[PDB]
Amino acid sequence: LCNKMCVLKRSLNAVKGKNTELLKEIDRANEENRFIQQEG
Amino acid sequence: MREAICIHIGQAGCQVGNACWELFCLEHGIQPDGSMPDAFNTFFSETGAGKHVPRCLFLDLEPTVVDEVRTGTYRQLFNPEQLVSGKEDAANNYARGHYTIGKEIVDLALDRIRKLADNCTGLQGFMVFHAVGGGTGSGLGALLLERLSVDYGKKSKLGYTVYPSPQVSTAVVEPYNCVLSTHSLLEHTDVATMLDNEAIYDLTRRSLDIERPSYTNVNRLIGQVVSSLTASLRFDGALNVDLTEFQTNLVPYPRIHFVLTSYAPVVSAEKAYHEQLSVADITNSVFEPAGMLTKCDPRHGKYMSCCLMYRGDVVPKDVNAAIATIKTKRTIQFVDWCPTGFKCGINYQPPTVVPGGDLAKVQRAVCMIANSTAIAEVFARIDHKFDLMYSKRAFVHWYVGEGMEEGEFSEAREDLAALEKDYEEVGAES
Amino acid sequence: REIVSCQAGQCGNQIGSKFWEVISDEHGVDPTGTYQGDSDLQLERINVYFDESSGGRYVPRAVLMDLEPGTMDSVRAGPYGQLFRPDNFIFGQSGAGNNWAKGHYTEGAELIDSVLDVCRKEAESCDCLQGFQLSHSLGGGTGSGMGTLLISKLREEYPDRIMMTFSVIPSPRVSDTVVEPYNTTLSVHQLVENSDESMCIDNEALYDICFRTLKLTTPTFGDLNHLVAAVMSGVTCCLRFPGQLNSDLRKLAVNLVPFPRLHFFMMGFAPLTSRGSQQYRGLSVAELTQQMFDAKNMMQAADPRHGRYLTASALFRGRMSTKEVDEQMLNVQNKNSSYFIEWIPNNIKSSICDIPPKGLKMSVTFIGNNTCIQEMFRRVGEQFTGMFRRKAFLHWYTGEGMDEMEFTEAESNMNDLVSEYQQYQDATV
Amino acid sequence: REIVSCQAGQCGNQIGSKFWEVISDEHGVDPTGTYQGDSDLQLERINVYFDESSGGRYVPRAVLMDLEPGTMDSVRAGPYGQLFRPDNFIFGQSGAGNNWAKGHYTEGAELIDSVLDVCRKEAESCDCLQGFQLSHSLGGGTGSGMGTLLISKLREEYPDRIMMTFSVIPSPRVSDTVVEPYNTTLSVHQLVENSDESMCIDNEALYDICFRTLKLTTPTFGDLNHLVAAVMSGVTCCLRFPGQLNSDLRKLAVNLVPFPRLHFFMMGFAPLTSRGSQQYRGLSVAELTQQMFDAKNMMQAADPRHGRYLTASALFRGRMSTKEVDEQMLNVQNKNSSYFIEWIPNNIKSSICDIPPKGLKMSVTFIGNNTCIQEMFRRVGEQFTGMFRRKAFLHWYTGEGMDEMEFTEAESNMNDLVSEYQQYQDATV
Amino acid sequence: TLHRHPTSAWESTSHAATR
Amino acid sequence: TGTTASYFQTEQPTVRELLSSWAQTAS
Ligand SMILES: Nc1nc2c(ncn2[C@@H]2O[C@H](COP(=O)(O)OP(=O)(O)OP(=O)(O)O)[C@@H](O)[C@H]2O)c(=O)[nH]1
Ligand SMILES: Nc1nc2c(ncn2[C@@H]2O[C@H](COP(=O)(O)OP(=O)(O)O)[C@@H](O)[C@H]2O)c(=O)[nH]1
Ligand SMILES: Nc1nc2c(ncn2[C@@H]2O[C@H](COP(=O)(O)OP(=O)(O)O)[C@@H](O)[C@H]2O)c(=O)[nH]1
Ligand SMILES: [Mg+2]
Ligand SMILES: [Mg+2]
Known part of the structure; x- marks a missing residue:
């Protein structure tokens, strides 16, 4: 059963992680917005 | 005369004290033997044989770092006493560092404090170095500061605290320890100085252009900034400012005394000395957010008060020119009810570099200690760090079994709530 | 500041023997009991695992325990073997x-008093005992x-002491005896209560590491025990040697136990x-991180990918960079979000010790309160x-008084x- | 400071023989009677046990006394043997x-007159006697x-002199006669009223020592007698040698006999x-303390846990810090105050000599008035x-004149x- | 190996002090 | 014998020698 279990949870961890770098760049863009508002 | 008692609480405090005493000895020309081959009396005291001993006291409930100092490179320099070590650590437990483990060493700690103060004649104050995120550095530090404030009236306290960094943290109960120790850091510490780790990490990564510093180098930089701020009473200068004279400037209101610090030019030789090191540029680097010793961005908050330690051959005309440029700059916008907002001190003694260090020896250095609205970000993120901790009773039994009341943590959360509330209140425009 | 070791059963005896092997190798202790190391800090904390004798020798603070004198x-x-008392x-x-009934009620009862007496003697010899460390299966x-x-x-009668109880949990594919489920x-349940900290061993992941990570041709019980003794030493490395950021057993307990039953x-x-492949690999924290949480390099027989990391910690040995270690742990936390519980952000702890193991530039021991252990417990x-529905093998146990x-x-x-594990792993903010 | 010894019976003769040949070895006395010691502290107080002769020979001040000539x-x-007078x-x-009366009433009474004659002859030659020692069973x-x-x-004729009686009293598991009950x-009661304090030896505790404590597969009576002679010689250590905190037999009596009948x-x-185990054990008084108070290390077949110590004394020999030894006695006192009696503070006693036995850097002799003698006497x-109910074996005594x-x-x-000991052990303040 | 404390080393602590 | 049957005893001494001597590290 862990043919599918293992492959699906590896996929989940990968999608997870790439989503978390998406969160990283979300924070980066929020920081960009805040200091461009400060600078303007 | 004009002496201060150095206190080094915890593992981080002991290592920071090691670094700062290394810097002090190399700067005053005192070899680890303890003798020079009267500006030192603030930090070193003579004996009958002409030997200098530091006026410091090391505490840690576990003996590894204290014994490392004992068997380090200063056996004959450090006193065999005033190097107090417990027998078993608090281990990131505020309850244990305050209630059941530190109580059996606090009495001897105050005994050593008395044995230092009575020797002292013109004691200016106490120079505490610790990290609130650690168990002993929170509990024992808090208890020691309370006892010191009780038995020494309104003597000045300068506590350099390594706060739990935003995301780069080395423990899981650091929010608990910080939110609990914020009490003592409020009532029984006259001035509390930020020591966020990521700020040092980023500035050493970028300005120093060195890939492999460590705790040794961050502690070296902290010792450098401590020496810069405290050298005004150590050496003669144009503007002599002592602990009281700048703490009265940095504390406008009794509760808002937490200060964030920066130091410049912190830089290696290669990029340091291919550019003309003036005063205007170094002040600009001081006020630049990424060249600051605290993980905060002042451009959100508002500067309420600033004090500058110029140390080198700086001249008052250059000082005033830099002050005028900073005032005219728009991004660093001060609070409405503090027009001047600038206090300055000048020293004629240029910085000294220690062998094996990463800093290049610089002709002129500038320290900046500011009380700002922007320092509220650290609390406004620590409270969100801690309410998630406290929502589902995480790591609460380790304190309850060791002697914590359940509601005391909620009371601490309410206290920090009052902290950001009064921060925004004083920062609010009239 | 010192740890007294205990070994139970023949498996526990073997693992304790090799743990003392690695400890003596690290501390420069001659099999004859004399010191033969070439360092000064090596003797700084020699008293942690050893007691000095009149002849200038060092003897381990070890209690050896069994019912067969053959082992x-x-x-x-x-x-x-010529090192112990x-x-x-x-x-x-x-x-x-191999019956828990005789091991815990009749054969063990008449000798548990003697082992408590000798353990008490060793404890009172110790100036301040800060925990026991038992190894067994x-x-x-x-x-x-x-x-x-x-x-x-x-x-x-030891309320504030710590339990490094290391227990070899059997597995269906390494099923050596039919009464392994009854024994476990x-x-x-008793390890839940009596022990502040408990730690798990299963031969599946040990065999997997020996097969693929080391590709040993014939890894026997010797390599099996050595692989985990490497961690049995690394748990207290920070206590026995100076480090940039120190830690001990009580540190790991307080920073890794969120709830009393989660230990x-x-x-x-x-x-x-x-x-x-020693030379071709370039030893660094960069690839150290990618094998920190690697399932095939994990020595616990339950995939961490099927569970959730409540808390985790890494005790590093050797000269390392404190921003690199913390930034790699931050990379772990900011690259995995649904296996680190959201309501406890930044679960990972890092500790640094200066002295690395012999033959290694830098090493690290992982510890984790992951929720994959409920799969081990349900299996x-x-x-x-x-086996309990049909009341099979109950007569052997009931003949001994239970x-x-x-x-x-x-x-x-x-x-x-296991219900607590499930409800602490499926929780939402 | 003079003591004169007497050996009674076969057991007494053997035990006194072994005690004499160990004390003569301690004092550097040749079996032929001359002196081969190398130290002066021996000759300073050699007169306590050995009578000097005009020929320069030190003959033991001992009275060998037994109806059987084979002994x-x-x-x-x-x-x-040639050393003895x-x-x-x-x-x-x-x-x-094996009869009471055949040694106490009819045949011993005729023989005892010459023994008193020779004993008082030895007594008069001494300047002043501390007292009389007897070894018997x-x-x-x-x-x-x-x-x-x-x-x-x-x-x-000697009312105010110490009477140190070392009896060897039996138990059924090693009871070699059926007349043990009558003969004890x-x-x-003769020991009760007519001895200031008697210190007793059990046969079975000695075998327990040899089997479990010293791990001897072949201990004999000669092996046992030296263990008894260790105490036999350590009781008078402060008499025979200088002490940092010296003592004597009157010291022990006045400090261990609160009430006259409890002796x-x-x-x-x-x-x-x-x-x-000698290799891996560090010879220190710190560990000597639990060797003092350990159950299986005792010289009596009565487990200390069952009873409660009234007053106990320790005779330490060697170069030790009185500092640390006194704090250790305090430590055992307050660690087990329940075992000791509450209404006498500091039930344990410290006495410190300088000279230890041969080859031993440090040695201890322990004396204890534990209430656990209740079990032994009651049994x-x-x-x-x-058998007294059945009027059996009693015909020997009745015919012999009793x-x-x-x-x-x-x-x-x-x-x-024996009724006293339980009602002093269960007493409450 | 077996170590025997000799009678040559025998002395009182008072003598050791006055040494 | 050094085995557990003999309780790890290299040799069997009489109490005379046993108390007249004390064992230390052979190195
Ligand atoms: N700036 C600086 N921070 C440090 C240093 N060493 C440790 N820290 C930080 O300070 C925090 C608290 O210190 P701890 O590691 O808990 O040591 P402690 O303060 O003595 O507290 P205990 O470990 O419980 O004894 C840690 O989480 C580290 O991140 C150092 O050398 N310099
Ligand atoms: N890791 C490891 N496991 C062992 C060793 N020896 C035995 N075992 C395991 O222990 C289990 C049997 O334990 P057992 O001998 O019955 O324990 P005992 O009854 O207390 O002696 C087997 O499933 C083995 O896998 C060893 O040296 N190392
Ligand atoms: N220590 C020791 N005790 C002995 C020896 N021989 C006999 N006994 C004890 O003496 C008791 C028997 O005494 P017995 O020989 O009849 O003494 P007697 O009647 O005076 O000759 C036994 O219970 C033994 O415990 C010996 O050689 N050494
Ligand atoms: Mg610490
Ligand atoms: Mg006296």
Whole structure:
């Protein structure tokens, strides 16, 4: 059963992680917005 | 005369004290033997044989770092006493560092404090170095500061605290320890100085252009900034400012005394000395957010008060020119009810570099200690760090079994709530 | 500041013997008991695992425990067997028969008092004992039953001490005896309460590491025990040697236990280098991180990908960079979000010690309170239910003075524990 | 500071022979009688045990006393037999036949006159006696009856001198005679009134020591007698040698006899480590303390846990810090205050000499007035009354000239002697 | 190996002090 | 014998030698 279990949870961890770098760049863009508002 | 008692609480405090005493000895020309081959009396005291001993006291409930100092490179320099070590650590437990483990060493700690103060004649104050995120550095530090404030009236306290960094943290109960120790850091510490780790990490990564510093180098930089701020009473200068004279400037209101610090030019030789090191540029680097010793961005908050330690051959005309440029700059916008907002001190003694260090020896250095609205970000993120901790009773039994009341943590959360509330209140425009 | 070691059963005896092997290698202790190291800090904390004698020798603070004197002879004839005290070599006459009943109620009861006496003697010899460290196997009778009976009887009067109880949980594919489920079920519930900290071993992941990570041609029980003794030393490395950011057993307990019943952990060691790829790999924290949480390099037989990391910690040894270590842990936390519980952000702890193991530039020991352990517990609870429905093998246990009610209570306690794991892993903010 | 010794019966003769050949070795005395020591502290107080002669020979101030002449022949055939004074070998022609009266009333009474003559002859030559030592066994016939006759007789002419009686009293598992009950019940009260304090040795505790404590597969009576002689010599260590905090037999009596009738003691010695465990054990007084108080390291077949210590003393020998030894006695006091009696503070006693036995850097002799003698006396009284109810074996005494009334009185004497210990051990303030 | 404390080393602590 | 049957005893001494001597590290 862990043919599918293992492959699906590896996929989940990968999608997870790439989503978390998406969160990283979300924070980066929020920081960009805040200091461009400060600078303007 | 004009002496201060150095206190080094915890593992981080002991290592920071090691670094700062290394810097002090190399700067005053005192070899680890303890003798020079009267500006030192603030930090070193003579004996009958002409030997200098530091006026410091090391505490840690576990003996590894204290014994490392004992068997380090200063056996004959450090006193065999005033190097107090417990027998078993608090281990990131505020309850244990305050209630059941530190109580059996606090009495001897105050005994050593008395044995230092009575020797002292013109004691200016106490120079505490610790990290609130650690168990002993929170509990024992808090208890020691309370006892010191009780038995020494309104003597000045300068506590350099390594706060739990935003995301780069080395423990899981650091929010608990910080939110609990914020009490003592409020009532029984006259001035509390930020020591966020990521700020040092980023500035050493970028300005120093060195890939492999460590705790040794961050502690070296902290010792450098401590020496810069405290050298005004150590050496003669144009503007002599002592602990009281700048703490009265940095504390406008009794509760808002937490200060964030920066130091410049912190830089290696290669990029340091291919550019003309003036005063205007170094002040600009001081006020630049990424060249600051605290993980905060002042451009959100508002500067309420600033004090500058110029140390080198700086001249008052250059000082005033830099002050005028900073005032005219728009991004660093001060609070409405503090027009001047600038206090300055000048020293004629240029910085000294220690062998094996990463800093290049610089002709002129500038320290900046500011009380700002922007320092509220650290609390406004620590409270969100801690309410998630406290929502589902995480790591609460380790304190309850060791002697914590359940509601005391909620009371601490309410206290920090009052902290950001009064921060925004004083920062609010009239 | 010192740890007293205990070994239960023949598996526990072997693992304790090799743990003392690695400790003596690290501290420069001659098999004859003399010091032969070439360092000064090596003697700084020699008293942690050793006691000085009149002749200038060092003897381990070890209690050896079993019901077969044959394994006592084996460990004594071992390469470092001439290091332990003879009085600690306490043993019975007839074995537990790999039966928890005889191991915990009749054969072990008449000798648990003597082992408590010798343990108390060693403790009072110690100036401040800060924890016991038992090594045993739950599958066996002697190792499991009287093993955990020792913790149960010492905790009644050692409130603030710590338990490094390391227990080898059996597996269906390494099923060595048919009564492994009964032996493990009767002992896990007791390890929940009597021990502040408990730590898990299963031969599946050890065999997997020996097969693929090291590609050893014939890794026997020697390599099996050495791989985990490498962590048995790394748990207290920070206590025995100076470090940039120190830690100890109490540190790991307080920073890894969110709730009192959540003290079943899982280790992991790095680096592990194959027999023919030492040079080609460039030892660094960069690839150290990618094997920190690697399932194939994990030595606990439950995939961490099927569970959730409640808390985790890494004890590094060797000269390292403090921003690199913290930034790699931050990379872990900011690259995995649904396996680190959201309501406890930044679960990972990092500790640094200056002295690395012999033959390694830098190493690290992993510890984690992951929720994959409930799979280990259910894969034996199912077997226990199956063998308990028909009342199979209950006559051996009941002939020694217990009843079916104790078995039912043990089953209920383990079911409650796995339910707690599930409800602490599926929780939402 | 002078003590004169007497050996009674076969057991007494053997134990005194071994004690004499160990004390002469300690004092550097040749079996032929000359001096081969290398130290002056021996000759400073050599007069306490050895009478100097005009020829420069140090003859033991001992009275060998036994109805059986075979024991005298054996002791003379021993390696140190020529050391003993020839005319002190007072012996009869017919043995006592394991009988009370045949040594105490009819045959011993005729023989005892010459023993008193020679004993007072030795006594007068001394400047002043600390007192009289006796070594015997209530188990034996002539060792018990005739020795107790001497016990009674010395009191009327030496009332205010110490009477140090070392009896060897039995237990059924190693009971070699069926007349142990009679021979001890008729003997206990003579020791009660006519000895200031008696220190007792059990046969079975010695075998327990040799088997479990010292791990000897072949200990004999010669092996046992040196262990008893260790205490036999350590009791007078402060007498014979200078002490940092010295003491004596009167010191021990006044410090261990709170009430006149409570003067029966149990013995302990240290160090007692097997040669195998000698390597890994560090010889220090710190560990010597638990060797002092350990159950299996005791010289009496009564487990200390069952009883409660009234007053105990320790005779330390060697170069030790009185600082640390005193704090250790305090530590054991307040660690087990329940075992000791509450209404006497500091039940343990410290005495510090300088000279230890041969080869031992440090040594300890332990004296204890534990209430656990209650078990032993009650049980031996039960053994007595079992046959005393049936009027069995009593025909020997009745024919030899003994009545029933004194039998009943002696049984009552143990009854009201042993009745004291439980009601002092269960007492509350 | 076996170590025997000799009688040559025998001395009182008072003598050791006045040494 | 050094085996556990003999309780790890290299040799069997009489109490005379046993108390007249003390064992230490052979190195
Ligand atoms: N700036 C700086 N921070 C440090 C240093 N060492 C440790 N820290 C930080 O300070 C925090 C608290 O210190 P701890 O590691 O808990 O040591 P402690 O303060 O003595 O507290 P205990 O460990 O419980 O004894 C840690 O989480 C580290 O991140 C150092 O050398 N310099
Ligand atoms: N890791 C490891 N496991 C062992 C060793 N020896 C035995 N075992 C395991 O222990 C289990 C049997 O334990 P057992 O001998 O019955 O324990 P005992 O009854 O207390 O002696 C087997 O499943 C083995 O896998 C060893 O040296 N190392
Ligand atoms: N220590 C020791 N005790 C002995 C020896 N021989 C006999 N005994 C004890 O003496 C008791 C018997 O005494 P017995 O020989 O009849 O003494 P007797 O009647 O005076 O000759 C036994 O219970 C033994 O415990 C010996 O050689 N050494
Ligand atoms: Mg610490
Ligand atoms: Mg005296």
